[PDB]
């Protein structure tokens, strides 16, 4: 893309998107999950490009040229993200995560605090502790013999029986270059994240400074999942959610206009005070 840069972050050379838009705050920080990169956000960036500064960091070993790197977790993702923001001179930002990029977002809210990071948006992030099928998927990702079997089972869950051309292209072309080094790590880090923090809902409730957070999601589609979101929102005045009714796990790809309007609402709320 026209906006892709590379910088040295501590020991590692990381790629990142920066449209270097000169405009009012806040900056929109789009956080990828595990074993994909800024390509997941190409449609969402087009929705936001004109009106906001947009930054998308890629994690260690992530990007157009994936590589083997030493083991790292979401704490390093957070430091890598802040170091890129410091280099760029960004003060105030609205972070937006996909799936297990949420662990990075919630820890980023904690470390950055509510003046720099007054709100956050989490997209399609499993709010409950792993149910058997997802727990099984993580087990296979960590298996050096069965990791691709793991990825195939997740792609099935993510597409949810849809022939969704753009999402299939992301999973089968834009993620094809990621290996056991990434997918194995993703299994290990996510399993440890739930084990250590209990759940995304526990981790958000545990913030020193609670702030406005919206969960926007298309799946899981079952009423039981909507109910845990409604029960959390009813108990926590700062928490909201919207079911986007997109076909796949990837609303940034399949309903980028819908994601964008939630992000614009939060950016507008920050600008008013
Ligand atoms: C791209 C992406 C989405 C996910 O939900 C996920 C789940 C487990 C491991 C890695 C992952 N990576």
Residue numbers in the entry: 3 to 275
Cite, word for word, the article reporting this structure:
The HODS101A variant was also considered interesting as the AqdC ABH-fold dioxygenase that catalyzes a chemical reaction identical to HOD naturally possesses an alanine instead of a serine at the nucleophilic elbow (hydrophobic elbow). MQO binds to HODS101A as observed with HODH251A. Although the S101A replacement causes the loss of the H-bond between S101(OG) and MQO(O4) this is compensated by the interaction with H251(NE2) resulting in an essentially identical binding mode. Under normoxic conditions, electron density at the R-site of HODS101A is consistent with the presence of a water molecule. Next to the R-site, a water molecule (W3) is also present at a H-bond distance from O1 (2.7 Å) stabilized by the side chain of H100 that is flipped compared to the HODH251A variant. W3 and H100 flipping are also seen under normoxic conditions in two of the four molecules present in the a.u. In HOD, S101A replacement, however, has a negative impact on the KM value of its organic substrate (60-fold increase compared to that of wild-type HOD) whilst kcat is not affected.
Arthrobacter nitroguajacolicus Rü61a 1-H-3-hydroxy-4-oxoquinaldine 2,4-dioxygenase (HOD) and Pseudomonas putida 33/1 1-H-3-hydroxy-4-oxoquinoline 2,4-dioxygenase (QDO) were the first dioxygenases discovered to belong to the ABH-fold family. They catalyze the O2-dependent breakdown of N-heteroaromatic quinolone-type substrates with concomitant carbon monoxide production. Atypical for oxygenases, these enzymes promote the activation of the triplet ground-state O2 molecule without the aid of metal centers or external organic co-factors. Kinetic measurements indicate that their reaction mechanism relies on a fast initial step, during which the substrates' 3-hydroxyl group is deprotonated by the His-Asp subset of the triad, thus promoting its activation for molecular oxygen attack (step 1), whilst the nucleophile is not essential.
